[PDB]
């Protein structure tokens, strides 16, 4: 859209102003039901050829069902919390006597339903598969005949298509040990997810956002095994809610900033330690330092608020003017001077120091820019690759407008050698 950033030379940092928050600040459970019947002994005589196939399929199905039965830089500042908390609570609710029977009875003929539980929670129940009807109307009458004589090769083949799911679901639940992330398409098909989205009690904007980005809401969801009593496989999906929608917010990148002293090892320098995302939620700001948790998709970010900071709203003031008596503006100081570079949304920041070649080149005319000293900026639509020392970075090539403001080397304000070389967590 209008992705723009303003590189401030005061402290080497890129602020990619202009995005949309779409934060995730809510959990919504949903119960997905696979119905299945309990077969007795096979009661089929004669090996034949197709009878062997049916026997293998039924044996593997029973093995799957019995296996599933036998189943039942600011990172330190973040708090911790349980992610599977709503799913386990709903499962513990389902363990109560006379509860899954409500799920089965109420969901008799429709596919989707809304029911009540012991504690009064209204969750969405959805039948995903209908193995009961197929196994009690199309296979057992054929197999239970005396002198089993399967005359239809289709019998087995379509059976495969109606067994695969109940097989491979179990497969995943045997590998991930109960909970799976992300929810695979076997656990929830795309059309199934789309149908389930438009039944949640949420506003129209939330439905539009979460229906148009099914891949991301698939990546951020959880799954958990529940009771299997009364021959009804039930598992809880944890499709995330989306409280705040369409509030402008930004991403901040930092880089080292050191003096070019001739004497090696005597160039003290500080770097801002705030890399990550800042999103304007309510009258405060929500801060995500973990850049790996935040997901990006076409100007819209999707980030879990469970790992965040409730930072005060007066944080853009520190971003604009570093030296203000209104925010401590956390930093970290060291005497290590090693060439490095970062790749922001619309350009490349270079912080190479000392005897180390620095270059920026493109595939058209080759070498275009050479960096002398200090951290510098190259816009994305001027260059294609950047290189520091002996390593090569590919700058992002997505359209946008970038403006490179002029600043001053703030570390020259400080005395040549009074700084400590000890802190990973300090402030101005």
């Amino acid at each position, epitope marked *: 859209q209008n992705i723009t950033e303003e590189f401030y030379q005061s402290t080497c940092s890129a602020v990619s102003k202009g995005y949309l928050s779409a934060l995730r600040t809510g959990w919504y459970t949903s119960v997905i039901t696979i119905e299945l019947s*309990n077969i*007795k002994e096979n009661k089929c005589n004669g090996t034949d050829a197709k009878v062997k196939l049916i026997k293998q399929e039924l044996d593997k199905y029973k093995n799957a069902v019995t296996e599933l039965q036998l189943l039942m830089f600011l990172g330190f500042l973040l708090g911790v919390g349980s992610a599977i908390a709503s799913g386990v609570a709903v499962c513990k609710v389902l363990h109560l006597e006379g509860e899954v029977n409500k799920i089965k*009875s109420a969901l008799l003929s429709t596919n989707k339903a809304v029911v009540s539980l012991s504690n009064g929670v209204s969750v969405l129940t959805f039948k995903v598969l209908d193995l009961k009807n197929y196994i009690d*109307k199309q296979l057992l*009458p054929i197999l239970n005949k005396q002198s089993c004589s399967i005359s239809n090769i289709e019998t087995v083949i379509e059976f495969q298509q109606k067994n695969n799911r109940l097989l491979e679901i179990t497969r995943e639940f045997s590998v991930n040990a109960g909970v799976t992330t992300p929810v695979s398409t076997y656990m929830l098909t795309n059309s199934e997810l789309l149908s389930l989205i438009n039944d949640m009690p949420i506003t129209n904007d939330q439905k539009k956002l979460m229906s148009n980005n099914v891949q991301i809401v698939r990546q951020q969801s959880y799954s958990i095994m529940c009771i299997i009593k009364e021959e009804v496989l039930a598992y809880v999906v944890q499709l995330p809610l989306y409280g705040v929608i369409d509030t402008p917010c930004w991403k901040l990148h930092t880089s080292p900033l050191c003096t070019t002293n001739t004497k090696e090892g005597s160039n003290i320098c500080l770097t801002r330690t705030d890399r990550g995302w800042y999103c304007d939620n309510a009258g405060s700001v929500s801060f995500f330092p973990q850049a790996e948790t935040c997901k990006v998709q076409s100007n819209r970010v999707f980030c879990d608020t469970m790992n965040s900071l409730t930072l005060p709203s007066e944080v853009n003031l520190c971003n604009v003017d570093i030296f203000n008596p209104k925010y401590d503006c956390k930093i970290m100081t060291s005497k290590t001077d090693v060439s490095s570079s970062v790749i922001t949304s619309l350009g490349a920041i270079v912080s190479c120091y000392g005897k180390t070649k620095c270059t920026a080149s493109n595939k058209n005319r080759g070498i275009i820019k050479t960096f002398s000293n200090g951290c510098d900026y190259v816009s994305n639509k001027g260059v294609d690759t950047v290189s520091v020392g002996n390593t090569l970075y590919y700058v992002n090539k997505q359209e946008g407008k970038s403006l490179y403001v002029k600043g001053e080397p703030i570390i020259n304000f400080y005395d040549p050698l009074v700084f400590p070389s000890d802190e990973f967590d300090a402030s101005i």
Partner: antibody
Amino acid sequence: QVQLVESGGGVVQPGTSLTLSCAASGFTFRTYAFHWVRQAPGKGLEWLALVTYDGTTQYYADSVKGRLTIYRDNSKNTLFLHLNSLRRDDTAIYFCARGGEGSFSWLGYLQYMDVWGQGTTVTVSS
Amino acid sequence: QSALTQPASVSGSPGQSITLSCTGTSSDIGDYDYVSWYQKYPDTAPKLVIYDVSERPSGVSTRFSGSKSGNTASLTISGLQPEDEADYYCNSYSSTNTLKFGGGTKLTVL
């Protein structure tokens, strides 16, 4: 001591949907399954309906499907019948039946007759 | 109403044998091996005497014998008794998810 006790019946005018009730005692009820048969004077037995554990799955007869509903309430250990649009040919005695061994829905495992009941007589007249 | 054909009545002297039968089709009685024979005295509830062609319940005398052949189920007795005057019914599973009863036969002794 396995025994079934019946309730309801009598003379019913054409139409006049009548709810019929069975009962059981002396054995586990939520495990075994039940079904319902009827017999008319001068004729034989005629399959009427079948219910497995809970209201999970219900099987109906070809000549009766649609006109009849059968369900169960395990809290009161009772079995209920609702038939509407009663015709002139429903004059008969209704019998409860107990069948099945485990938690199964396939009707092939559900044809056993371990016990029977006493039946209720229902007749229509004008 | 579809049913299963059975003889109207059979009569035999005490201490003899009978060959009662009921005929169906390829998808009922003749298959699925679920043939059942039920007793009925007048004014009394029916009882299960034979199930799954030849298997027998508890408390039944060994005089009965059930079998199936082609599309016909057959019941045979030995040593007829005066209390055998009753009604016989054959019940078996039909392919279209139903349990089909017979027409009823009357057994009398002379």
